[PDB]
């Protein structure tokens, strides 16, 4: 105890093992020793200060990626009463992105602590020489506390050289500790803006390399009045839903959406309608991809095929059917626009009510009810998207339009003939109820509990 020297008690190389020390016995973390390198790479240095070649033993954080924080404190014990201060020579290896602070406190037998030393940040890549004196005379329960923070917070230390007296002039200070946790503070949120005359070739923000994350750019493709916008792509390689491109066609406060493409592979082109195509970039912070190109080419009616005039009905997909599929019972146009609903109501209070307004091919008109039965009643109910025929009765002939004679036949389709030969025509006031909506159809019981 008394005969044991204080230097050998404090100063320790811990090459083969720890010297006579008190490291951790009560806290929830225990320091570990790293032989040059270990698992979880980028753990400070790859060697110690003495050996320095792939085989040096140095103390560091107990583990690598920690789930939560752990308080690690190197304890000590009082020493003999020394008049002169105590020179403490050491070299730390503080480095990392989530590094925390470490303090050196002094305790006594009167429940009094002091905290004056504290450092945090990345101090170079090698061992940074440091020195600090001690103004403790007799009673001093000093300690070296730290914290096991999240990933990228490993701190190393080696070759404690606490001596007595005052050492020589310390001329090896820390050159510059750069704050890594705020590496660059990305808050640009800018770049290219609303474009102009066709300078089609342009980078998005950093196109000739993988793009960085957290970037929120915007490209408002505009043109002259009456000109649409085209968005042909020569190369498209993005990430999943986390990285999408919400192509907008607002032109005002009420923004509209046209298409949202993502992922790798050449996606289809976009054909806007107005003269302002707003292109916003939405990227996540995980696994940023390469990017894509965009060469807009303005014009007139791009994408949408030119409709054929001179009695050529153009269905919503671009196909032309002059008179072969003008609501006659065929499915030429695959979008269903050729066989669209050429029937509706008239003077109807609710949705499933009104007149018997019918269009044979071009002009809308009424009908007649001389041979009206329940069969054609439910037929026109189903054709109008309704349920079964609840009731039907005429009121009075309103107009003298080209009404059609409805007929029935076992072939399924109804026979129609727009003959204008009918006195006191009875206009059908169709009263059809709704179909099987969201009502309880199963055999449910009554268990109010």
């Amino acid at each position: 105890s008394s005969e044991l020297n204080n230097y050998e008690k404090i100063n320790c190389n811990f090459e083969d093992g720890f010297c006579f020390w008190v490291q951790d016995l009560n806290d929830d973390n225990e320091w570990e020793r790293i032989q040059g390198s270990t698992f979880s790479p980028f753990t400070g240095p790859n060697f110690d200060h003495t050996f320095g070649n792939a085989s040096g033993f140095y103390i560091s954080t107990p583990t690598g990626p920690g789930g939560r924080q752990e308080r690690v404190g190197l304890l000590s014990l009082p020493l003999d009463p020394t008049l002169e201060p105590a020179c403490l020579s050491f070299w730390y290896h503080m480095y990392g992105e989530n590094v925390h602070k470490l303090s050196i406190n002094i305790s006594n037998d009167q429940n009094m602590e002091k905290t004056v030393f504290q450092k945090e940040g990345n101090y170079g890549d090698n061992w940074n020489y440091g020195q600090v004196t001690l103004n403790e005379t007799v009673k001093f329960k000093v300690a070296f506390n730290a914290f096991k923070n999240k990933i990228l917070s490993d701190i190393a230390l080696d070759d404690i050289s606490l001596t007595y007296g005052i050492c020589n002039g310390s001329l090896y200070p820390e050159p510059t500790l750069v704050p890594t946790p705020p590496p660059e503070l990305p808050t640009d949120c800018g770049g290219p803006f609303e474009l102009w005359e066709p300078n089609t070739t342009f980078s998005s923000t950093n196109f000739p390399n993988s793009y960085p994350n957290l970037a929120f750019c915007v490209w408002i493709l505009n043109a002259q009045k009456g000109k649409n916008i085209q968005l042909h792509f020569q190369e498209f390689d993005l990430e999943n839903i986390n990285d999408v491109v919400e192509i907008r066609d607002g032109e005002e406060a009420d923004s509209l959406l046209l298409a949202v493409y993502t992922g790798p592979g050449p996606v289809k082109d976009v054909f806007s309608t107005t003269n302002r195509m707003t292109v916003l970039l939405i990227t996540n912070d995980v696994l940023a991809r390469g990017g894509f190109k965009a060469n807009f080419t303005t014009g007139y009616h791009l994408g949408i095929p030119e409709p054929c005039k001179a009695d050529h009905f153009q269905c919503k997909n671009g196909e032309c059917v002059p008179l072969v599929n003008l609501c006659d019972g065929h499915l030429h146009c695959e979008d269903g626009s050729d066989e669209a609903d050429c029937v509706r109501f008239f003077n109807g209070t609710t949705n499933n009510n009104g007149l018997v307004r019918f269009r044979i091919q071009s002009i809308w008109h009424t009908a007649c009810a001389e041979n009206w039965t329940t069969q054609i009643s439910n037929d026109v109910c189903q054709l109008l998207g309704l349920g079964s025929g609840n009731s039907s009765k005429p009121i009075f002939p309103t107009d003298g339009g080209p009404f059609v004679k409805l007929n029935t036949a076992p072939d399924g389709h109804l026979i129609l003939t727009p003959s204008q030969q009918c006195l006191q025509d009875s206009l059908i006031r169709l009263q059809c109820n709704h179909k099987s909506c969201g009502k309880k159809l199963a055999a449910q019981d009554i268990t109010p509990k």
Binding site: L256, V260, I282, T350, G385, S436, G438, Q444
Partner: protein
């Protein structure tokens, strides 16, 4: 629902689940035999590959998928609302088309769309739905109190709120019975913090998009 009771098998035939690559991703309301209606905030960015999506119709229990009441269907077309936004988050609805037609069986029935000029008054108790499909009663609230409780975001008329004032029990449709018939008063869109007080929950008002939904049912 956390504070919800188990619903009877067959009481909600218009409640199905959407599977994205074999995984239940979002809810949908079966409107027609070939077109469904779901929220756009959950199916966004996935409309490029409709073949990966698949809808299990008549699904009540995930472990009881071997029952013949569950009719699988494949998606081939996804239509997102044009007025959808990710920053403003307005009009988050999207329809999905089915590959083949399905028959209205005992456990597969279409839902009713809210007709125009029909506003649901506040304070109307009606439960919702969407392993075990539980349900819980959810009353209707006003837009003024809903905006005053959450002043961080502007809730316009295009959406309607419905939920408990004190919280605790909060893609699913907002089914509210009207004249012995259930309607589609909204879809379960989002929630700031579940099981927290003063969290009614804003739902997309379907009554403002009746003509938009009916235009694709044919």
């Amino acid at each position: 629902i956390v504070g919800g009771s188990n619903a009877k098998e067959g009481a909600w035939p218009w409640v199905v689940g959407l599977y994205y690559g074999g995984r239940l991703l979002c809810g949908a309301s079966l409107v027609s035999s070939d077109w469904l209606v779901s929220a756009a905030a959950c199916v966004y960015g996935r409309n490029l590959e409709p073949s990966k999506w698949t809808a299990i119709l008549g699904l009540h229990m995930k472990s009881n998928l071997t029952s013949p009441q569950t009719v699988p269907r494949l998606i081939d077309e996804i239509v997102i609302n044009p007025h959808y936004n990710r920053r403003r988050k307005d009009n988050a609805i999207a329809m999905m088309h089915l590959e083949f037609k399905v028959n209205y069986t005992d456990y597969i029935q279409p839902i009713c769309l809210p007709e125009e000029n029909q506003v649901f008054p506040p304070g109307r108790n009606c439960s919702i739905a969407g392993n075990i499909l539980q349900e819980a009663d959810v009353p209707l609230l006003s837009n003024e109190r809903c905006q005053q409780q959450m002043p961080e975001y502007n809730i316009t008329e295009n959406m309607i709120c419905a939920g408990y004032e004190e919280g605790g029990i909060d893609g699913g449709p907002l089914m509210c019975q009207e004249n012995n018939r259930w309607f589609l008063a909204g879809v379960t869109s989002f929630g700031y913090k579940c099981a927290l007080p003063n969290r009614p929950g804003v739902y997309a008002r379907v009554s403002r998009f009746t003509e938009w939904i009916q235009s694709f049912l044919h």
